[PDB]
Amino acid sequence: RLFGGLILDIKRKAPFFLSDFKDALSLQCLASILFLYCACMSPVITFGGLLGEATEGRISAIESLFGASLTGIAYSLFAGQPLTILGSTGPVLVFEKILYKFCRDYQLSYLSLRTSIGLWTSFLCIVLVATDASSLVCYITRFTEEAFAALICIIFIYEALEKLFDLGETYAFNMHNNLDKLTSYSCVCTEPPNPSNETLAQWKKDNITAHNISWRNLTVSECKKLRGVFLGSACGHHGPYIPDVLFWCVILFFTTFFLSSFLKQFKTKRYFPTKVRSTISDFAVFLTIVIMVTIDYLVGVPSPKLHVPEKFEPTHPERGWIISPLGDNPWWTLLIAAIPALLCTILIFMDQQITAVIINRKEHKLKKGAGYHLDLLMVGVMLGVCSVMGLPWFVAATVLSISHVNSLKVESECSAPGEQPKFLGIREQRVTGLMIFILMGLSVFMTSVLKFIPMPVLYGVFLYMGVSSLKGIQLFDRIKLFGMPAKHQPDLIYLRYVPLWKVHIFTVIQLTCLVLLWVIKVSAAAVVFPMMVLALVFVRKLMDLCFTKRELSWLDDL
Amino acid sequence: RLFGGLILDIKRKAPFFLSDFKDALSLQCLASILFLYCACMSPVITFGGLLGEATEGRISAIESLFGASLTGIAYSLFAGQPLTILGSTGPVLVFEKILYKFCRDYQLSYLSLRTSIGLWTSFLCIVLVATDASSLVCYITRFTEEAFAALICIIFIYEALEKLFDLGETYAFNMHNNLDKLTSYSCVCTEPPNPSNETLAQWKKDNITAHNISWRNLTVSECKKLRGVFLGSACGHHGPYIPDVLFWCVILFFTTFFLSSFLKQFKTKRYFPTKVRSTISDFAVFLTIVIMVTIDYLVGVPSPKLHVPEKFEPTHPERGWIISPLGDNPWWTLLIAAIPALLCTILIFMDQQITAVIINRKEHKLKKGAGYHLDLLMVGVMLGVCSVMGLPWFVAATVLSISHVNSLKVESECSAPGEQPKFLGIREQRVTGLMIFILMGLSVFMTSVLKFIPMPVLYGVFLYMGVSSLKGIQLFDRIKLFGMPAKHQPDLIYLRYVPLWKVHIFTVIQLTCLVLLWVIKVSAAAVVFPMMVLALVFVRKLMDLCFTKRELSWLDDL
Ligand SMILES: *[C@@H]1O[C@H](CO)[C@@H](O[C@@H]2O[C@H](CO)[C@@H](O)[C@H](O)[C@H]2NC(C)=O)[C@H](O)[C@H]1NC(C)=O
Ligand SMILES: *[C@@H]1O[C@H](CO)[C@@H](O[C@@H]2O[C@H](CO)[C@@H](O)[C@H](O)[C@H]2NC(C)=O)[C@H](O)[C@H]1NC(C)=O
Ligand SMILES: *[C@@H]1O[C@H](CO)[C@@H](O[C@@H]2O[C@H](CO)[C@@H](O)[C@H](O)[C@H]2NC(C)=O)[C@H](O)[C@H]1NC(C)=O
Ligand SMILES: *[C@@H]1O[C@H](CO)[C@@H](O[C@@H]2O[C@H](CO)[C@@H](O)[C@H](O)[C@H]2NC(C)=O)[C@H](O)[C@H]1NC(C)=O
Ligand SMILES: *[C@@H]1O[C@H](CO)[C@@H](O)[C@H](O)[C@H]1NC(C)=O
Ligand SMILES: *[C@@H]1O[C@H](CO)[C@@H](O)[C@H](O)[C@H]1NC(C)=O
Ligand code: NA
Ligand code: NA
Ligand code: NA
Ligand code: NA
Ligand code: NA
Ligand code: NA
Structure with missing residues (x-):
């Protein structure tokens, strides 16, 4: 039938709607909200500024903030798995760059063509929901859901480090000065x-x-x-040398990460009460931000700060929020705009579904069931709404969603005669995302407070999230201690039943695929990057050849 | 009889004389030499400079270097336990100051009176060796040998941190500058x-x-x-502000400590060969120094550097190396100078013996026996020689000697069946100290190379040594996890046989004594500080009262 999967998912998710709101009456919910608000805002503002620069001032930061708030609210209120955080994806910023120059090359209006493309993409997403293509999730195995995660986490860590390395160009210090000739x-x-x-x-x-x-x-x-x-003795490449700003930024960046790592380890200490070992151990990255902001304010060195826009009206003076599909274009651009819509719909579908597969892994011990059709339906609906209103596109983000899930973990009480409380489950709720995306939309009123947050602290938080998201992946458990290293091995049940050289070959197969993904990640095909999820499945199929099915679904599997 | 203990110690130590030299044919010996050369030089130069400032240029750094080299060579060649590193104590830079105002207020010659006092102190030390008073070592128990180690290590760590905190005064940065007004x-x-x-x-x-x-x-x-x-916009309290030198020093100081801690942990890793997990794991603080010196040289910021004197002749132009006891003084100053000699001899005796007791603990599993009479005899002989030549006084140092012992530990090669390699013993030898104190005396020729070593790297090495010397003391094992904390306890055999509240009282007794030692450490009695070892024994005696002897020598004396 038509819409059958959507009806089944709605029937599954309806019973737990009230429990989803009632389960959010603890302190860890507020801790997660305060953790993720700052870590989710900065990419939105950066992407908005970059898109405004690329589009000559058509889609600036304020539109990005408003679109993120709307999409997050309407996704948290009505969707499937509510632990997925929608976030502005880099790739998109590529799709506009070719588009705008195209609209500059012939003589077309940018907003109308973009709105038509977005509307047709939304229609194709709704059609895909109708056809029930999300059942293709049954084909994704642990092989992909443990490579893609590793690749995304490594890319996130590298980007967090590159954002700090970039600061050296703007704030250049003097490499050779004489301290006796300061006069x-x-x-x-x-x-x-x-x-x-x-x-x-x-x-x-x-x-x-x-x-x-x-x-x-x-x-x-x-x-x-x-x-x-x-013309002077302190001149540089262009502009006077900036004294002692870069090294202060480095100190901030590394001190934030080290302090957060230290503060997130009081759940193992023993010389404290039980209400102080779980109140500054679940508030590890919000206390860190406050302490580092206070230290930066006291020292007074002018490090870069977070700039939140203050105005509420749109950027361009003539941008009243509505965009008809055709207002200054020939009538055939509507029928031609459908051609990129197929590619955009396929790309967004694959990204959202791989993120949903990663989040709903069996190791997290989900109690309330998850649904994939409703996620895609609501993502398509809000994609259409954002395209009509003239707002940037938002799809699921992997690192942010993994950090959101890891922040709601529930652990047991004992651990000394045993160890690290056994993981009982993820706290299932809907208030956290709703509050995060409500607070994101209200940042236009709290500009006077957000201006005191330095950027290196946020970069350190990004690095901490990228490092902490690695913990859990099975890939590393082999990659770390199988391929090259030593002779003796840990328990690792999969060995309890298979040859070691087979494990080596298995790891090498995954490593070659990961390297290929990294190589073609930037390339010239970054536009069509996630489409590669259609390639790892083909390799997985062409692996039963020189692998007995027993070894195959004993060393992969789950 | 007379000199009986000295004869017994010589008879015990004579058989192992050749083995002491033959056992030094491994790489860890060179690793310890390179570790300790730099960590032992800097205090010598700092003390020499301070004494030269206090004595108006009579005893400068070069005399300190020559005296340290002579004393170390003649102690390593002929002594008892050769793992004790003689080092310039702080207490003295006080005697040799007061003794200066004096020789001025009145009208006395400083060098002659100091030489007479040193000669009489050496004579009293020789008499103490003759009387065999070192048998009083039998009275020192684990109680003192585990406070006077904790107190000294904590003081060393605090001094290492204070040396970094001091750098902010000389290199003051600008707390409020406008980056737009650099013109x-x-x-x-x-x-x-x-x-x-x-x-x-x-x-x-x-x-x-x-x-x-x-x-x-x-x-x-x-x-x-x-x-x-x-008169300008960059002026300060006195002198123009120094740009970006303090924060670079902080980065150097903390990066050195973190990198050394990371590099000294490859004996637990598993993804490396056996000849690479014990060749950059026993060379952890010499690779760190080279890497950080290279980084500092490449960056080029003018951080403070190590200044080794280049001349070989004495500092004062008329200081030909010999000092007759009386050359410009009345003949009764010789007979009056003996009065401070008793106090100096007692103080030096107690310091040297408490250091020897700490080093020869039973947990280190010493194979070759140790002797206490010969140590004191040779310390007194070199004290007399240094006093005659006009060189500063040298006695045993606790943190340096503990770091020397910890650097020669020998561990097994089996961590899979059991756990971290069981400690088999301290490598007993005499070449390490001899080579260290030979290289110290030759630093006057390698000034062009030692000038590239920044001081914050050495401060980070000092902090690492101070932190690492803590590991092993039994005190913390109670202090950390007994007094306040939680309810459940580890195994801790002494509990397997005694009341918990008794353990609490026992820990409180030690803590009160440690606090008293800290309070009277600086006070006005820093002159007569180590004499307090005569006070902890009295408290230990007055502890059998409200303690049954079973609990007493089950929780206390090991
Ligand atoms: C500082 O001494 C110098 C040397 O005479 C003078 O300043 C200038 O120095 C450059 C390079 O030697 C030359 O152009 C002239 O010698 C000086 N230029 C002038 C005076 O216009 C001057 O004597 C001193 N500077 C001041 C500001 O008093
Ligand atoms: C660059 O500036 C120069 C200097 O004013 C100008 O060059 C003139 O170029 C035109 C032809 O384009 C000639 O007829 C003039 O004779 C040139 N000026 C002189 C002083 O020779 C001009 O403004 C700029 N050059 C160009 C090619 O536009
Ligand atoms: C920069 O503008 C100021 C304003 O006229 C001038 O520099 C000095 O400014 C102070 C404070 O206003 C006053 O003592 C005088 O106005 C100026 N002093 C002088 C000229 O000796 C000047 O016009 C400009 N400075 C320069 C170097 O051109
Ligand atoms: C401080 O400098 C002043 C200024 O030259 C001097 O003061 C003179 O003090 C003497 C008495 O000590 C008087 O007879 C002079 O008349 C003072 N000078 C003037 C100009 O009144 C002197 O060099 C210094 N002061 C002292 C007390 O030594
Ligand atoms: C330059 O002069 C013209 C005419 O004199 C005037 O119209 C113009 O406004 C001036 N420029 C500026 C920036 O005001
Ligand atoms: C100052 O002048 C006197 C006599 O004119 C002279 O002897 C002295 O050397 C001069 N000062 C210096 C520092 O040379
Ligand atoms: Na990512
Ligand atoms: Na990032
Ligand atoms: Na993604
Ligand atoms: Na010390
Ligand atoms: Na020190
Ligand atoms: Na000492």
């Missing part, structure tokens, strides 16, 4: 000899006379605007 | 209006005319010498 250490703005006729043109259309302007007062920004030349 | 950020030396008549006097006896001198070129050191005034 002769200054930068001065002077007029440029024989300036380029381009700059002369600039001055003329700005009515700028070289002679009358005082040059010895112009500050760095004004000097760069007026195209001046710096 | 107006400079310091300028200008002539001081209505300068003090003191400075006028200075200029007159130096023939310095205010008018003709150019003030806009004088550098920071020249400006401070000429008593100028700084």
Whole structure:
């Protein structure tokens, strides 16, 4: 029948609707909210700023904030597994870059074509929900759901490190200064000899006379605007050297990670009460942020800070929030815009479904059942709504969702004569995501407070999340201690039943696939990256050949 | 009889003399030498500089280096337990200060009186060796040998941290600068209006005319010498702000400690060969120094460096190395100088014997026997020699000796059946100390290489040594997990046979004594600090009262 899977999922999920809200009456829920609000805001603002730069000021940060708030609210209220956090995906930012120049190349209107493409993508997603294609989830095995996770976590860690490495270019220090000659250490703005006729043109259309302007007062920004030349002993590539800002950022970045790691380990200590070993051990990354913000405020070094937009009206002065599919375009662009819609729908479907498969793993001991058809239906509906309103596209994010799940773990009480309380289950609820995405939409009113949060602290939090998300994957348990290392082995039940060289070959097979994914990740096919989930399944099928089925579904499997 | 204990100790130690040299044919010996050379040099130079400042340039760093080399060589060649490292104690830099005002307030010669006092102290030490008073070692129990270790280690850690905290005063950064106004950020030396008549006097006896001198070129050191005034936007309390030197020092200090801790943990890893898990796991703090020196050289920020003196002749131009007891003093100062000799001999005897008791603990599983009379005899002989030559006094150091012993530990090669390799014994030898104290005396020729070692790296090494020396003390094993904490307990055999509240009272008794030692450590009695070892024994005697002897020598004396 049609819509049969959706009806079955709604019937399964309906009984637990009230329990989903009632189960959120503990402190760990507020701890997760405060943990994830800051860690989820920063990517949204960065993506919004990048898209506004790429689109000449059409889709800026405020539209990204509003779209994220709307999509998160309507996903947390009505969906399947509510522990999935929708988040702005890098890939998208690629799809606009080719699009806008395309709209610049011929003579087309960007917003109308984008809205038509989004509407047709939403229609195709609804059709896919009708056909019940999500049953293809039955084909994904542990092989993919333990490679993709490792690749995404490693990429996240590398991006977190690269974001810190980038700070050295903007804030360049002096590699060779004499501490005895500080009396002769200054930068001065002077007029440029024989300036380029381009700059002369600039001055003329700005009515700028070289002679009358005082040059010895112009500050760095004004000097760069007026195209001046710096002449001094503290000059650099472009602009005076910035003293002691980079190393303070490095100290902030590493101290935040180390302090969070230390504070998230009081559930193993013994010299404390039971209400102090689980109240500053579940609040490890919110106490860290406050402490580091206070330290940064006391020291007073001007490190980069978080800028949240203050206005509420749209960025472009003529962007009243509605976009008809066709207002300044020929009628055939609607019928041509459907061609990219198939690719976009397939890509979004595969990304959302692989994230849902990763989240609903059997090791998390889910009690309330999960549904895949409703997730895709609501993702498509909000994709259409966001496309009509002129808002950026949002799909599931893997690292954020894994960190959300890991923050609601429930552990038992004993552990000294035993160890690390046995994991009993994930706290199943719907208030955490709703509150996170409500607070995201209200950040326009709390700008005066969010301006005190330095960026290196957020980068350290990102690195901590990326490192902590690794714990749990089965891949590493082989990769770490099987391929090369030593001779003796741990228990590792799968060995209790199979040859060692077979395990080596199995690990090598996964490693080659991971390397291939990394190589073709950036390449020229980053546009169609997640489509590769259609390739690992083919390799898994072509593995029963030189593998007996017993070894096959004993060393993989689950 | 007379000298009986010395004869017995010589008879015990004679058989193993050749084995002591032959057992030093492994790599761990060179590893210990390279570990301890740098960690032992820096205190010597710092103490020498401080004493030269306090004595107006009579006993500078070069005399300290030469005295340390001589004393270490003659102690390693002929002594008892050769794992004790003689080192310049802090207490002395106080005697040799007061003894300076004196020789001035009155009208005495410093070197002659100091030599007479040292000679009489050496004579009293030889008499103590003759009387065989070192048998009083039989009275020291585990109670003291586990406080005086904990107190010394904690003091060492605090001093290592304070040495880093001190760097903020010399290199002061700017707590509030505007990054847009770097075009107006400079310091300028200008002539001081209505300068003090003191400075006028200075200029007159130096023939310095205010008018003709150019003030806009004088550098920071020249400006401070000429008593100028700084007038600019980058000025501070005294002198221009130093950009990005303090935070680089902090990064060096903490990175060295973290990297050393990480590198000294490859004896637990499993994904490496057996010749790479014990060649960069016993060379953990010498690879760290090289890596951090290379990083500091590549970055190029002018952090403080290690200054080793280059000259070989004595500091004062008339200090030909010999000092007759009386050359410019009345003949009764020799007979009066004996009064402080009793106190100095008692103090040195108690310090050396408590260090020897700590080192020769039964847990280290010493095979070759130890002797206490010969240690004191040779310490006294070299104290007399150093006093005659005009060199600073050297006695045993606790943290350095403990780190020397811990660096020669021999571990087994079986961690799979059981656990971490069971400690088999301390490698007993005499080449390590001899080579360390030979290399210390040759540092005057390798100044061009030692100048590249930054000081924060050495402070990080000091902190690592102070932290690692804590591991092993029984005190903490109670202090950590008995007094306040939780309800359940580990095995801890002493409990297998006694009341818990008794253990609490026992720990409280030790804590009160430790607090008293800390309080009277600085006080006004730091001169007579180690004499307190005569007080803990009295408390130990007055503990059998409200303690049955069974509980007493089951929880206490091991
Ligand atoms: C670059 O600036 C120069 C300097 O004013 C200008 O060069 C003139 O170029 C035109 C032809 O394009 C000539 O007829 C003039 O004689 C040139 N000026 C001189 C002083 O020789 C011009 O403004 C800029 N050059 C170009 C090619 O636009
Ligand atoms: C920069 O502008 C100021 C403002 O006129 C001038 O520099 C000095 O500013 C202070 C404070 O306002 C006053 O003593 C005088 O206005 C200026 N002192 C002088 C010129 O000796 C000046 O116009 C500009 N500075 C330079 C170097 O051109
Ligand atoms: C401090 O400098 C002042 C300024 O030159 C001097 O003060 C003179 O003090 C003597 C007595 O000590 C008087 O006879 C002079 O008349 C003082 N000078 C003036 C100008 O009044 C002197 O060099 C210094 N002061 C002292 C007390 O030594
Ligand atoms: C500092 O001494 C120098 C040396 O005479 C002078 O400053 C300039 O130095 C450069 C390089 O030697 C030369 O252009 C001239 O010697 C100086 N230029 C000038 C004075 O315009 C000057 O004597 C001193 N500087 C000041 C500011 O007094
Ligand atoms: C330059 O001069 C013109 C005419 O004199 C004037 O219209 C224009 O506004 C001036 N430029 C600026 C930036 O005001
Ligand atoms: C100052 O002048 C006197 C005599 O004119 C001279 O002896 C003295 O050397 C000069 N000062 C210096 C530092 O040379
Ligand atoms: Na990711
Ligand atoms: Na990231
Ligand atoms: Na994803
Ligand atoms: Na010490
Ligand atoms: Na120290
Ligand atoms: Na000592």
